[PDB]
Design a protein around this nucleic acid. Structure first.
Lengths: 150, 17, 110, 142, 103, 56, 117
RNA sequence: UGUAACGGGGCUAAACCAUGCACCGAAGCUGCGGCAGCGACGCUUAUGCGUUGUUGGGUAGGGGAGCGUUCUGUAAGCCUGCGAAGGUGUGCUGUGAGGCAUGCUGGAGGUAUCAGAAGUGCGAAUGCUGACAUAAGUAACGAUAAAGCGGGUGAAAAGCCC
RNA sequence: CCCGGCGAGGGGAGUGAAAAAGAACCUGAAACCGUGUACGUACAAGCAGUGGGAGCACGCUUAGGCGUGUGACUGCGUACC
């Protein structure tokens, strides 16, 4: 805290409490006994534990029929309307389009939509899988998920 | 609203010795 | 009808004018005027001006016939005070309170 | 249900006359204190003066056993430089015989505003004549 | 015309047709109750029990309420010993109306 | 020389009970000019016993 | 994540001041003093919940004693007769009977005297 | 300092010794209801118990279970200008920290549930800052060189001008 | 527009959804200081409360009492860290 180490008043005889500096935590305008430091909150998670969790989440989604396997899911042109129409007829509003390979047309189409999110198999996290109401995979996406899970 | 700056030296006490 | 009349930030202290307020409280305006006229305090003239204003508001903004008017509610409440530093002996400093008050007058026929 | 409490407004107080001739001072006073407090009534209440009025006659005729008649000393301080005064039983009887009865009862009664209130009802006369016949004070055998 | 009976560990004196608030019982809110435990019956004439619990006297009452009593706050505090505790209590009660008083 | 502990507002008020002012309640009316004034004093405009005294 | 305690503090202080309402002077206006009164009031209430039972007990005994003396028997003797006669009327009722129904209380002592004799 | 070596009154039994029968007397025991801990049995099996017994004063301190506050996800959800947060009352409810509902003020934000993270709870430290009391309408109004009167201006003149 | 000292300050009018939003201006808490109403208090002693409790003044359904405020009198009771 900006200031000086000067004692505001001598240490005896005064009819006031003993003070050492104006920067004391119990003094106005300067203090904070335990000031925060910039620290990282990242936690280690075992690879087997992380993989085991994904298997559990995938199993649960299948049981609760929140996971749907379909053939290739692509859009002829990079237009959001086409993606919106292709989902309305399917009656999907909060969906995660997990595709085997990232496609620019699909990526651009889903970028504006917030309830619709498109990702690759590599780019999957447990939080996103649970958060999204439905997940639709592709045959290739499922196959690559099988092998890398092992 | 400045707190009193100069506090005079206390009056010497009666010698209880 | 209420015809209030306030004088805020009066020079005198709230206490000192309360003595004058008690003299005229509940009494008819006719006797109130002379009592304040012949009372030897500035609070007398300070309150008298407020009482005169209250009568004027009643006569002008409301029904006439000020003769049948009584001071129903007279009270004073201390207002903001000004802080002043005054030197004392041995180099010490004390704070002088230039107190003020708000005088409210309410006169009604009934 | 809630226990009954005597209501001071609706209290009937009787009048009694007691002769202090040939009676022990303390034993007499104890009886009066019990009567004044109203402890002899089935509707007694600690915070209500349910007692009766008692008139004491022939107070100067009261007697004390043993040597108390001369050895009993009443001390009272006047709250001054050295104002401690003492008077034995004889001088108190000679000066005012009703004081000893009053002091005896006051000590036996509770201390407090209600305690003083019941003591108001005591009426002690040195002689055998009282001017309270208008209250029909039937004699009490005790 | 009143009777004294022992119901909840404490005698109650109730007259005919009066509501008495006594301690909780295992009875429904609309169910009549049985009190064959009568200690005394009083009328214009005087009748007293030669044996505890009369001989044939009984009290008929109808349960009306099964509420809880007023809140009572229990405060335990030890001076200078750094010990303070608080607690609350609401005793259950059963309010009944006396419908009949036998002899 | 100094207080052991601050008095109570009630004790404060009791002390001030005797500081209340009292109105004169003795206004006198001149016989001729008929103005209110203190007894044994000249009116504001300068009449006493009717006859003018200040001549101003 | 700085946490301010202004809202909570007033809520706690009001709750104490509400219980301290009716006390004299600063005991109902100042939290620092009202808290002592509320705690001390709690102790007395806890203590008096037990003193109340004994105060009423002694009040009833005095009422029964007064009725017994008036009707010609000591309180101690009267209780013996009821115990000997096997009467389970408590002090509260006996005091209640004495105040209201004189005739009933007369019946009580007559059996009490009979039981002693 | 004042009786002042029964707590006082007062007592010749209201004192002391012995015997006997009664009663008063605590938060002790019992009676009625309620909550919780631990060990058991019959049976429920992540929990009820027709039940069985017993325990439940408590500092230092150890152990167990919780309420509430700010922020993040859930949440572009939900409540909300026919009125949010806050403020001020009242009425209910929980063993407690609390919670719920509503009147008035207020004026636009708030946030269930389940989790996560803490600048997570104040009555004291001759604690820090601001505000306001107390003493108190009290001491004081700063050289004991000194003022008085008329007139003038002014709402008002012991203090200003002549 | 009116009182006031060609003031301060206030009362009407007017602007505004709101002027106890009037520039001393969002919300406006506590200490502290007042006015009004109800009750208590001038023969009564002490951590100022708690238990009991009369009366009185306001509200209820019932005509019996319950609620709110106050609290005479009385038992017990020497703050907190």
């Amino acid at each position: 805290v900006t200031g000086s180490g000067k004692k505001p008043w001598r240490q005896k005889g005064t009819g006031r409490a003993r003070s050492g500096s104006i920067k004391s935590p119990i003094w106005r305008s300067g203090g904070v006994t335990f000031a925060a430091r910039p620290q990282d909150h990242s936690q280690k998670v075992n690879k087997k534990m992380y993989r085991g969790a994904l298997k559990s989440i995938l199993s649960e989604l299948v049981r609760q029929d929140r996971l749907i396997v379909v053939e290739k899911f692509s859009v002829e042109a990079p237009k959001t309307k086409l993606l919106a129409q292709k989902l309305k007829d399917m009656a999907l509003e909060d969906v995660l389009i997990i595709t085997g390979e990232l496609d620019e047309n699909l990526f651009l189409a889903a970028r504006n939509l917030h309830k619709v999110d498109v990702r690759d198999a590599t780019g999957i996290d447990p939080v996103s899988l649970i958060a999204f109401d439905k997940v639709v995979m592709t045959a290739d996406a499922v196959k690559q998920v099988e092998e890398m899970l092992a | 609203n400045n707190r009193p700056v100069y506090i005079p030296r206390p009056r010497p006490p009666h010698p209880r010795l | 009808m209420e015809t209030i009349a306030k004088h805020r930030h009066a020079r005198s202290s709230a206490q000192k004018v309360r003595l004058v307020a008690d003299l005229i409280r509940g009494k008819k305006v006719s006797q109130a005027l002379d009592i304040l006229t012949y009372t030897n305090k500035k609070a007398a003239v300070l309150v008298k001006k407020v009482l005169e204003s209250a009568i004027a508001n009643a006569e002008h903004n409301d029904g006439a016939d000020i003769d049948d008017l009584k001071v129903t509610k007279i009270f004073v409440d201390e207002g903001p005070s000004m802080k002043r530093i005054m030197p004392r002996a041995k180099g010490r400093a004390d704070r002088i309170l230039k107190r003020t008050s708000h005088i409210t007058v309410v006169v009604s026929d009934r | 249900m809630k226990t009954f409490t005597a209501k001071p407004e609706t209290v009937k107080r009787d009048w009694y006359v007691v002769d202090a001739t040939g009676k022990t001072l303390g034993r007499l006073a104890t009886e009066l204190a019990r009567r004044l407090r109203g402890k002899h009534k089935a509707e007694y209440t600690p915070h209500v003066d349910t007692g009766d009025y008692i008139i004491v006659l022939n107070a100067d005729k009261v007697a004390v056993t043993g040597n108390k008649r001369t050895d009993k000393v009443y001390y009272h301080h006047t709250g001054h430089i050295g104002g401690i005064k003492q008077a034995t039983f004889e001088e108190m009887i000679a000066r005012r015989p009703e004081r000893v009865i009053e002091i005896a009862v006051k000590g036996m009664l509770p201390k407090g505003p209600l305690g003083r209130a019941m003591f108001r009802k005591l009426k002690v006369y040195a002689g055998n004549e009282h001017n309270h016949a208008a209250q029909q004070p039937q004699v009490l055998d005790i | 015309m009143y009777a004294v009976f022992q119901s909840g560990g404490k005698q109650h004196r109730v007259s005919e047709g009066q509501t008495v608030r006594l301690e909780k019982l295992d009875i429904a809110t609309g169910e009549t109750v049985e009190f064959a435990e009568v200690l005394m019956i009083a009328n214009g004439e005087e009748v007293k029990i030669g044996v505890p619990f009369v001989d044939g006297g009984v009290i008929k009452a109808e349960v009306v309420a099964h509420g809880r009593g007023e809140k009572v706050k229990i405060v335990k505090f030890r001076r200078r010993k750094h010990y303070r505790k608080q607690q609350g209590h609401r005793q259950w009660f059963t309010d009944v109306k006396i419908t009949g008083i036998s002899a | 020389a100094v207080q052991q502990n601050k008095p109570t507002r009630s004790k404060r008020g009791m002390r001030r009970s005797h500081d209340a002012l009292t109105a004169v309640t003795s206004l006198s009316v001149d016989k001729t000019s008929g103005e209110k004034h203190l007894r044994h004093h000249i009116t504001a405009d300068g009449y006493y016993r009717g006859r003018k005294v200040i001549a101003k | 994540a700085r946490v301010k305690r202004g809202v909570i503090a007033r809520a706690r202080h009001k709750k104490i001041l509400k219980q301290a309402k009716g006390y004299y002077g600063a005991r109902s206006r100042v939290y620092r003093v009202a808290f002592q009164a509320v705690i001390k009031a709690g102790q007395y209430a806890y203590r008096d919940r037990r003193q109340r039972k004994r105060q009423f007990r002694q009040l009833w005994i005095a009422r029964i004693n007064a009725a017994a003396r008036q009707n010609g028997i000591s309180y101690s003797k009267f209780i013996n007769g009821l115990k000997k006669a096997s009467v389970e009327i408590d002090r509260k009722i006996l005091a209640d009977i004495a105040v209201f129904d004189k005739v009933a209380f007369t019946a009580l002592v007559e059996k009490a005297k009979a039981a002693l004799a």
